[PDB]
């Protein structure tokens, strides 16, 4: 009996289409982020701050066009959680290989699983656990195999603080799920006020550059201000502030800016759509399908790096290990959704 797949898809087709859209948005968001931060390697904080400002005004415009007394305290909690998440990620990605990052995403799956069991009282089926261990074991084995071979430096403490970065983004995802599916706040108002408090908590991210085990992004107490002014000079105008001795094994990354506002704008648009469709998935379906649709981007980034049109001049060949990561993801997610389907059928049957 293999005709049942059509009915199963035609019942709930929006989640698969939304996963396709989130895929096409997340791969392009990361692609354009690394393409602009290869164009402006310095001035990262400025890029994120301007991105949050335009996120805020764009979401307020969209809320005006389309959309306990108030939830500003909850929005501030969400934004501070996201801020410490990006702190711990920015710290952990200094000594972390490209494979352990995908394994870290696959480890953000069960963190979210357990913390959604604990706080907001989920009930998991047999097949759900089987799918999660399937995906995580497969991708862990293959990426740890690839990381034994890579020359990319690695320290276990930095991978651990990357997991510690996964923790508060889970707190924020499930508390926005709470404020969506309990109080019925709008998506757009939430994202606008979250971006407001993200401006503030990124300007409080600013003191993390002071510590010196950063390779090229370390900035002392004296030249944080000039870095900001030079970042505005590069982005908003196109002035290049470092063209002398610069690059690999040196102090700062080399910057080109005469046409970087365009790439930054595309990155910001794709990240805006990423956060928007993320909040839509979290409000509409769950904060647990979102982590699956967010872990699609690990294997898919490797799939997309095969092309020169997407990844500029630094591509790779289709090794079978990327394909088995992809197909392990697919089998795990399929059996996970099947477990969710049995759970929903047993719930609606009673």
């Amino acid at each position, epitope marked *: 009996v293999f005709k049942l797949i059509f009915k199963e898809i035609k019942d709930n087709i929006f989640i698969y289409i939304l996963s396709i859209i989130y895929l096409s948005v997340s791969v392009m968001n990361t692609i354009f982020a690394k393409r602009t931060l290869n164009k402006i390697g310095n001035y990262s904080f400025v890029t994120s701050e301007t991105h949050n400002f335009i996120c805020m005004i764009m979401f307020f415009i969209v809320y005006s066009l389309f959309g306990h007394r108030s939830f500003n305290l909850q929005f501030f909690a969400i934004s501070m959680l996201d801020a410490c998440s990006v702190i711990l990620a920015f710290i952990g990605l200094t000594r972390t290989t490209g494979n352990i990052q995908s394994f870290v995403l696959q480890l953000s799956i069960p963190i979210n699983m357990f913390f959604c069991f604990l706080i907001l009282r989920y009930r998991y089926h047999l097949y759900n656990y089987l799918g999660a261990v399937i995906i995580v074991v497969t991708i862990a084995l293959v990426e740890m195999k690839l990381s034994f071979e890579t020359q990319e430096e690695n320290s276990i403490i930095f991978n651990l603080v990357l997991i510690s970065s996964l923790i508060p983004v889970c707190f924020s995802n499930m508390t926005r799920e709470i404020v969506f599916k309990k109080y019925k706040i709008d998506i757009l108002r939430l994202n606008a006020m979250v971006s407001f408090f993200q401006l503030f908590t990124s300007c409080l991210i600013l003191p993390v550059y002071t510590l010196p085990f950063l*390779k090229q992004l370390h900035l002392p107490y004296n030249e944080i201000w000039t870095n900001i002014k030079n970042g505005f000079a590069c982005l908003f105008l196109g002035r290049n502030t470092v063209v*002398e001795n610069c690059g690999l*094994g040196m102090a700062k990354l080399c910057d080109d800016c005469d046409g970087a506002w365009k790439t930054f704008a595309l990155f910001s648009f794709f990240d805006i759509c990423d956060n928007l469709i993320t909040s839509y998935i979290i409000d509409k379906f769950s904060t647990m399908t979102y982590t699956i649709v967010s872990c699609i981007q690990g294997p898919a980034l490797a799939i997309a790096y095969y092309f020169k049109f997407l990844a500029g001049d630094v591509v790779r060949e289709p090794r079978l290990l990327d394909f088995v990561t992809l197909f392990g993801y697919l089998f795990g997610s399929i059996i996970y959704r099947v477990g969710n389907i049995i759970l929903e059928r047993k719930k609606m049957r009673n």
Partner: antibody, heavy 127, light 105 residues
Framework: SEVQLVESGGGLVQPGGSLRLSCAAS????????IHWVRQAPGKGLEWVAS????????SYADSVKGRFTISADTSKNTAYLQMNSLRAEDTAVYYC??????????????????????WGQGTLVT | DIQMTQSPSSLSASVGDRVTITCRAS??????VAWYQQKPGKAPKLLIY???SLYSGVPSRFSGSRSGTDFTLTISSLQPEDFATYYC?????????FGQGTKVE
């Protein structure tokens, strides 16, 4: 201020013995970068010997020297040592200590580090 | 594991020529290879990192390119200080293998 990597311990050693080389690094911090020894025999190409990441303490060796050599680092004094044991007659060569200069590309959810051997020492001859 | 078979071991080229030194890796290395130039009796200077980018201090004559695994260094116009031995080096997998050299004369 300016980067240097000055070696020591080179010279004549009998076949089947021990020798310790010691590259002292100036300017940059040894902990935040790879350090690796690379040899070349008279009139031949460059051959990798070993490598160390002193912060993780992670050591790697070539296939012809594994189990015989031992690379290490004392990051308190900011140098790096290579002991060669059970030395043969085909290991005579000029040995350079050298680091990886690293370029840190970073998107807000991931980071790729590219490497290239930035600064080389002047080299010590071993026989 | 990976070895880098270098194009022509030694090429003869006068001043003002355009020389192209090629090295193909065995399996799919990414853009992360580098190129050095060692004169007789000195340490190898770094010329190119990541197969496309000039190191700080390198003149504008040297350039790197790739198509798959066949990396290619090229010089726009040789000068009498560009006569040396040129190696390429991968940085993907841990058995580090240089090229066997390429002497310009």
């Amino acid at each position: 201020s300016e980067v240097q990597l000055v070696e020591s311990g080179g010279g004549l050693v009998q076949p089947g013995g021990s020798l310790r080389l010691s590259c002292a690094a100036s300017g940059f911090n040894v902990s935040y970068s790879y350090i690796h020894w690379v040899r070349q025999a008279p009139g031949k190409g460059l051959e990798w010997v070993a490598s160390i990441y002193p912060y993780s303490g992670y050591t790697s060796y070539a296939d012809s020297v594994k189990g015989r050599f031992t690379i290490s680092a004392d990051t308190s004094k900011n140098t790096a040592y290579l002991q060669m044991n059970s030395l043969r007659a085909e290991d005579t060569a000029v040995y350079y200590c050298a680091r990886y200069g690293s370029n840190y590309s970073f998107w807000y959810r991931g980071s790729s580090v590219t490497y290239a051997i930035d600064y080389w020492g002047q080299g010590t001859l071993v026989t | 594991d990976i070895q880098m078979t270098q194009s022509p071991s030694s090429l003869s080229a006068s001043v003002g020529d355009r020389v192209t030194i090629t090295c193909r890796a065995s399996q799919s290395v990414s853009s992360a290879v580098a190129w050095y130039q060692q004169k007789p009796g000195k340490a190898p200077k770094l010329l190119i990192y990541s197969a496309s980018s000039l190191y700080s201090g390198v003149p504008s004559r040297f350039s790197g390119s790739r198509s798959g695994t066949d990396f290619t260094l090229t010089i726009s116009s040789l000068q009498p200080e560009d006569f040396a031995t040129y190696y390429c080096q991968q940085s993907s997998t841990w058995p580090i293998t240089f090229g066997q050299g390429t002497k310009v004369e």
